[PDB]
Design a protein around this ligand. Structure first.
Ligand code: ZN
Ligand code: ZN
Length: 98
């Protein structure tokens, strides 16, 4: 990357709230980012659980994209919701059969 600049046009460079799952009514009509968008996990720590077959792009962050994360994260991180959690049972005792 050398230019960095990006003409000012009506295009959302954010992670579509649908792409996350894959059910986005508008495919090529989605003003948001789908693939190009850089992977989060791959960055959060460096390695992605998915692997080489990730649904997200693993390209090297750029002066541009970089700005995205700053927002995406800030939004999510800041706005966090509580969710139940527990430790599933490995193996509960069972009766006998004869
Ligand atoms: Zn979309
Ligand atoms: Zn990934």
């Amino acid at each position: 990357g050398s230019s960095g600049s990006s003409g000012e046009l009506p295009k959302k460079r954010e992670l579509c709230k649908f792409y996350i799952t894959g059910f986005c009514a508008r495919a090529e009509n989605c003003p948001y980012m789908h693939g190009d968008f850089p992977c989060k996990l791959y960055h959060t720590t460096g390695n992605c659980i998915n692997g080489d077959d990730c649904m997200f792009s693993h390209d090297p962050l750029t002066e541009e994209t970089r700005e995205l994360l700053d927002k995406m994260l800030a939004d999510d991180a800041e706005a966090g919701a509580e969710d139940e959690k527990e430790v599933e049972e490995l193996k509960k005792s069972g009766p006998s059969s004869g």
